[PDB]
Amino acid sequence: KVFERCELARTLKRLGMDGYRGISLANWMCLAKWESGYNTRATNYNAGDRSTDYGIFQINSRYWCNDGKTPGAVNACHLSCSALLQDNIADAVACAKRVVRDPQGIRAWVAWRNRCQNRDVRQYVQGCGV
Ligand SMILES: [Cl-]
Ligand SMILES: [Cl-]
Ligand SMILES: [Cl-]
Ligand SMILES: [Cl-]
Ligand SMILES: [Cl-]
Ligand SMILES: [Cl-]
Ligand code: NA
Ligand code: NA
């Protein structure tokens, strides 16, 4: 599914994302916007290294989920990458939380550094009741 902005903001808030490891809801929203356009079915194959990015947060198969086809990959979220293509985002949120428990935090996603870091991100949550 493709979420609408404020729908997604409240969904993430109910799933415990606001302030998770210091990361505001607006930052999670900015991440989802630029990774996938709020689309849980989004996929991107990286021909350069044979990995794939899955779901609303575009979480990568080399480290975080198992798809069976990424060489030498691990599965730190202990999930099939299929779980990251569901309309319900609970599993994707649990995995994103795992990602940011690592040293880099939200910086794990280059798109966040490019599109969200040191920016005014208020617009992503304005009017949503969060
Ligand atoms: Cl939690
Ligand atoms: Cl916020
Ligand atoms: Cl595995
Ligand atoms: Cl699996
Ligand atoms: Cl920062
Ligand atoms: Cl509001
Ligand atoms: Na599992
Ligand atoms: Na960290």
Numbering used by the authors: 1 to 130
The authors write:
Human lysozyme contains a polypeptide chain of 130 amino acid residues that includes all twenty of the common proteinogenic amino acids in its sequence. Having established an efficient method for Fmoc removal and NCL reactions in the same reaction solution, we wanted to explore the utility of this method for the total chemical synthesis of a typical protein.
After five synthetic steps, a single purification was carried out to give full‐length human lysozyme polypeptide 20 in good yield (36 % based on the starting peptide segment 12). The full‐length polypeptide had an observed mass 14 700.72±0.03 Da (average isotope composition) and calculated mass 14 700.63 Da (average isotope composition). The purities of the full‐length lysozyme polypeptide products obtained from convergent synthesis and the one‐pot sequential reactions were similar [Figure 4 D, (a,b)] although the overall yield was slightly reduced. Finally, the full‐length polypeptide 20 was folded with concomitant formation of disulfide bonds in buffer containing a redox system consisting of 5 mm oxidized glutathione, 2 mm DTT in presence of 0.8 m Gu⋅HCl and 1 mm EDTA in 0.1 m TRIS buffer (pH 8) to furnish folded lysozyme protein 22 after HPLC purification in 38 % yield of isolated product (based on the amount of lysozyme polypeptide 20). The earlier retention‐time shift compared with the unfolded lysozyme molecule in reverse‐phase HPLC and the altered charge distribution in the ESI‐MS, characteristics of a folded globular protein, was clearly evident for our chemically synthesized lysozyme molecule. The crystallographic model was finally refined using Phenix. The refined model had an Rwork/Rfree of 16.2 %/19.6 %.
